[PDB]
Amino acid sequence: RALVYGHHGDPAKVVELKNLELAAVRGSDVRVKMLAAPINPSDINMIQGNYGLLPELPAVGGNEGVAQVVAVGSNVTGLKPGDWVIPANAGLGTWRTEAVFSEEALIQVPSDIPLQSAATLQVNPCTAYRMLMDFEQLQPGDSVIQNASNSGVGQAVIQIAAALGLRTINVVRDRPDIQKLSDRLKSLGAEHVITEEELRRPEMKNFFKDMPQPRLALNCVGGKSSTELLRQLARGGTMVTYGGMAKQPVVASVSLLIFKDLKLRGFWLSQWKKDHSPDQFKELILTLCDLIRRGQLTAPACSQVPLQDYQSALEASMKPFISSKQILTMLEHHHHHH
Amino acid sequence: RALVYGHHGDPAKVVELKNLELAAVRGSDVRVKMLAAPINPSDINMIQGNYGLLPELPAVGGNEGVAQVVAVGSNVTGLKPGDWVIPANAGLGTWRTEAVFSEEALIQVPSDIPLQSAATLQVNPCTAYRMLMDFEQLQPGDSVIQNASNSGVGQAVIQIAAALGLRTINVVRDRPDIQKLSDRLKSLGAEHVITEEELRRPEMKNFFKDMPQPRLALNCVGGKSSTELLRQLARGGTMVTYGGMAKQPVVASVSLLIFKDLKLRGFWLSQWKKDHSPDQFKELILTLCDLIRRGQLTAPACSQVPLQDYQSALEASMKPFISSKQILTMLEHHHHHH
Ligand SMILES: [Cl-]
Ligand SMILES: [Cl-]
Ligand SMILES: [Cl-]
Ligand SMILES: [Cl-]
Ligand SMILES: [Cl-]
């Protein structure tokens, strides 16, 4: 059982449930059992068409998730049955029950962390951690600002930053129960939570007098919101973009580039993974797993949905005001989900 | 005789001709005679209000130019009468006949290069050279793309790049005699000259098959034009912005930042000058002067206008389709200008 698309378009209509047969297990091959796989923007964009990579249709959707190794090829010894794995590369097709992959296509992850955390490791904490490390040299006490803070990545940024002794200013969209949301992000380690509406005020720049100007800003919104994010950076600061929409480009005023000497950059985890070794990626995973055991990092609220009920999850993920992230689940759990 | 403004606004109405008296020459002071001074965007923005710095009104306008040292203070020995000087710092007020400055406010420039070239040294070639050096490591054969190529900076970029064995793609705005303009920029060393209209075609990216993708783009336009400039960069390339307008921000698509790993930066010569020593700035000037003697760099077409006829020059500089640059001239010449 697989979630397959015959062409590119709106995932609602484009993607459908189909049945396949599993290939032979060569000496280098690993047969797995999928446990869980998230619906990520990249997955949606790979269905829609506008994404960096596009596999050969008819293709299986989804790029991330976690699977248990069930059977193993003649001469693979680095992966044993019972090991949890995640994809080493993009476009593997993870919205399936079982598959066969070469051992180089897979990366072992420890099987003692929670299943949800394993499934979202790449999109969320891997991305958050990398952005915090790769652009500005941040020491305990330094600040970071970000938008879409209630997102999967946003919540990972909050937790990881706090683990690094950093001080976060967290922008979220305006909403009726901002107070509840504010309090929850603060419990995760957020120092401040402000709305986009608050961000746009000229009196925002030096609003929080008891903390230093951030040299790092993380953006997922674009448009005027990204410009207002830029505006909060110290001189010589960097704003990193890791998501957004086609028709909402990042916008940088001439005066901010020139007089404030700001830098705009992107981050793409897939690119990072390609430019680095398995050991370096394994090192990142271990670091994150240690945070998850030390209690310094937990996964956000995520609605579990069966592979059968993909339609429900596929449309709910494509809310303009994206609520809880949708995790496709291939296992049964203690509480049954119809 | 001085060009003075009592407040900020439209330079046409704001700036006016006034008479002052010259201060005492302290031990550290240098009395000069202004020879020429350009009308630069920064000068206009310093009159308008929206600029990084704003001196104390009533202030003298203009930030750049060249002057001959006429008289010198008790204990200054590094500047002799007859030496040409340019301002070491911004906001000196150069739209004057004579003044008194401290020797640290001035920088000697060789007096054997043409007067026009001395007057525009900072805005034009200093800025062009710095942008070519400070962002991407360019070796002979590498390409650079830029827009507003017919500008003062644009023409300096063309000449300096050619001197460095680089290969330029030069974007200009669409116009009735594009051919004449194309030919002139090519004679200066431009390899290709294309219009903004041509740039916007999807078929532009690999249009010039016989040259490598630029890792450096220089932008002065913003808006959709800057996005199309960005689009021509090799993966990991940098677009540097050194001018533009308030209501024409730079626009960077999410996909270009993320998938192409592009960098957006600004450049401000005033900032560079502050972050570096007099010797390092002197080194830049000497390099440029050597290019000017070697015949590798000449100043563009520039209409000379007397200090008396500033109004004419002040409005002509503020064309939306800026023609020949306006140089305020304090000297008489072989051909008299009424
Ligand atoms: Cl937000
Ligand atoms: Cl707060
Ligand atoms: Cl142009
Ligand atoms: Cl051409
Ligand atoms: Cl950078």
Numbering used by the authors:
A (entry chain A), B (entry chain A): 44 to 381
Q: Could you share sentences copied from the article?
A:
Mitochondrial fatty acid synthesis (mtFAS) is essential for respiratory function. The structure of MECR shows a bent cavity of sufficient dimensions to accommodate acyl substrates with carbon chain lengths from C4 to C1619.
Our in vitro and in vivo analyses indicate that the MECR G165Q variant allows synthesis of octanoyl groups but not long chain fatty acids, confirming the validity of our computational approach to engineer substrate length specificity. The structure of the Q165 side chain is well defined by the electron density map. The mutation site locates in the domain interface in between the α helix αD of the catalytic domain and α helix αA of the cofactor binding domain. Furthermore, in wild-type MECR, the side chain of K316 is hydrogen bonded to the backbone oxygen of G165, but in the MECR G165Q variant, the lysine side chain is hydrogen bonded with the side chain of Q165 and the backbone oxygen of P130. The introduction of the glutamine side chain to the position 165 neither affected the overall structure, nor the conformation of the catalytic tyrosine (Y94) or the NADPH binding site, but together with conformational changes of an acidic (E107) and basic (K316) amino acid, the modification induces a change of the acyl binding cavity of the mutated protein. Clearly, the G165Q mutation blocks the acyl tail binding tunnel, in good agreement with the changed substrate specificity.
